[PDB]
Symmetry: C2
Subunit: 351 residues, 2 copies
């Protein structure tokens, strides 16, 4: 048993499509900081915690399902909900947490540290730490983009300044050294939530795709991008808030976690070495989905669940990274598959 | 009841829940329903598109909706609206195959058809429903209906056939002798719940000190929140460019509105008389009652109101949609329905 020879912790990612429980074993260096972080357990249940009825029966039954069969007991647990939960009013959220609190108090096998909806900024911080641990780069400026179901996050080094809001900035000391980060999160710009604004725009789907209200897809990536861009800059003002900061704090290497990898390593996009550029992404989306005829394209992939959405998503990614953030179309973006960020919680609690 | 009159069931499979309605009616020379009377009403949550797409789950949900009704051997229409439209066809099939199965094992209900209707068909039943209740179908004056939904919004009014406009935005039918032609439009994504997800971190849209999901505080101000909502209206959806020129050519002689507006207008916080409002008075009251009020105080003052937190946002949004979007005079009267009336009576009629 790993946890007889090592420290162990559970982190629950209470995300938008389901909850995923992670259990990690680890050692600690000279400063009681985790090293040799290894995931020893990993179970996901569906749907998201924010999408279940908020009462004792449903919640008790939900947690029981997530946690009954876990191979290690008597370890600290963190339950962290992200953007799906941020969409509910604080008053609705409290109902979920008060029942969850009562469940965890009646059991003797888990030791709950906190159960809460984390802010996207905190989410950003855990993303950055997880990736930098993973790349063995915690001793060049590293940037992280996390593309989620309901929100997206961006994080990268920036010296502290009092002109920029306190919630958008973090300082920490890490394996001996002082790192200041800018954290941002855009609620509503996740792929799932943004997409609900564009389901009727012909330019975002393959030719003759039947759109929800009866019109036909007439796919064109450049055009769909500009539509997505209207939402990013006119509404959320991504460009105005992010671009001038990147202009003063250039990033050396970009890592994207979350949904981009699902698209990138689909049967429909082709990249090598887990790297893309937005130029190639938009061009591939344009030629390989947007200008394809839906009948024929569905004909080759009649059993694939998000193919239909790939003209819009390639267009969205470009809009966000290039028109929002102001990353050069030719700048390499590395990507990690979602199959992670909860490694960031293991790390942050020992600083 | 249904041996003295001929009758039918309609299921409104809405975004937030499903609503079964059983109607008794009679007919006239034109074989059109008259004396339409709702004899049974059952409501359950959540929305159909929101439950787990499996046989056990879909089974129990349907049974809970339908096995209740004190009637035997009745035709039923199952119409799913905007919540289902949010899902790709391949995602919708499992729901409907599970539905076919359920109905096939009983004979209480004779399923006529089960279908995801368009926002345009929705907008047709809306308009039928209002005018049936108003007794204006059996012309002289021009009634329009705006339907304020969870995920989408509908607007509908009379307009003579035009070959420039897509067939999908135009409905033609003969009723009680006279033919009628209607413009129908639906904005998927601009319904109340979906649009809210883009503005949750907007201080201008919330009561002073409301805790925004990101950690900043509400600092209420209606005009300002309204302008923000207006960017989603026009810069993203192009409502003004689509609707205003038409209305200008085909003026509406009276405005009705069903859905979320009625709940708001008839809440404790807003004062309206005679089942009518104006946008100028809505946005002033919103700004006065909510936006410019302290949150804790107002929260403590209305313990039973779980929508209250978004009344600053909702009043600014309704004004953005009706005034900056549609073009309606801030001083113009809008009738709201306060509730023996549902859009599903329009399904009874339309056949």
């Amino acid at each position: 048993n790993p946890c007889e020879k090592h420290s162990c912790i559970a982190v629950i990612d209470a995300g938008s499509t389901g909850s995923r429980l992670h259990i990690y074993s680890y050692d600690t260096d000279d400063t009681n900081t985790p090293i040799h972080i290894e995931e020893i357990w990993n179970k996901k249940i569906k749907p998201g915690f924010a999408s279940i009825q908020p009462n004792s029966v449903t919640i008790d039954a939900y947690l029981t399902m997530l946690l009954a069969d876990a191979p290690i007991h008597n370890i600290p647990v963190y339950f962290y909900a992200t953007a799906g939960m941020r969409l509910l009013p604080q008053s609705q959220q409290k109902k979920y947490y008060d029942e969850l609190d009562y469940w965890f108090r009646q059991q003797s096998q888990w030791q709950l540290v906190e159960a809460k909806t984390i802010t996207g900024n905190d989410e950003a911080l855990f993303d950055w730490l997880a990736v930098n641990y993973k790349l063995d780069t915690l001793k060049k400026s590293v940037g992280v983009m996390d593309m989620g179901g309901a929100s997206v996050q961006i994080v990268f080094p920036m010296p502290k300044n009092a002109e920029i809001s306190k919630h958008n900035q973090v300082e920490l000391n890490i394996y001996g050294q002082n790192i200041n980060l800018y954290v941002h999160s855009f609620l509503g710009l996740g792929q799932t939530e943004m997409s609900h604004q564009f389901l009727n725009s012909p330019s975002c789907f393959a030719n003759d795709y039947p759109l929800p209200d009866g019109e036909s897809g007439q796919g064109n990536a450049p055009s769909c991008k500009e539509e997505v861009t209207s939402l990013m800059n006119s509404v959320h003002k991504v460009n105005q808030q992010i671009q001038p900061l990147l202009a003063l704090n250039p990033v050396n290497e970009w890592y994207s976690i979350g949904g981009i990898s699902n698209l990138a390593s689909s049967q429909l996009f082709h990249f090598e070495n887990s790297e893309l550029t937005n130029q190639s992404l938009l061009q591939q989306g344009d030629n390989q989905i947007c200008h394809q005829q839906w009948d024929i394209l569905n004909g080759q992939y009649p059993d694939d669940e998000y193919l239909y959405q790939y003209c819009l998503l390639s267009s969205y990614y470009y809009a966000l990274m290039v028109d929002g953030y102001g990353i050069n179309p030719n700048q390499t973006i590395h990507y990690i598959p979602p199959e992670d960020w909860t490694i960031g919680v293991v790390l942050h609690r020992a600083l």
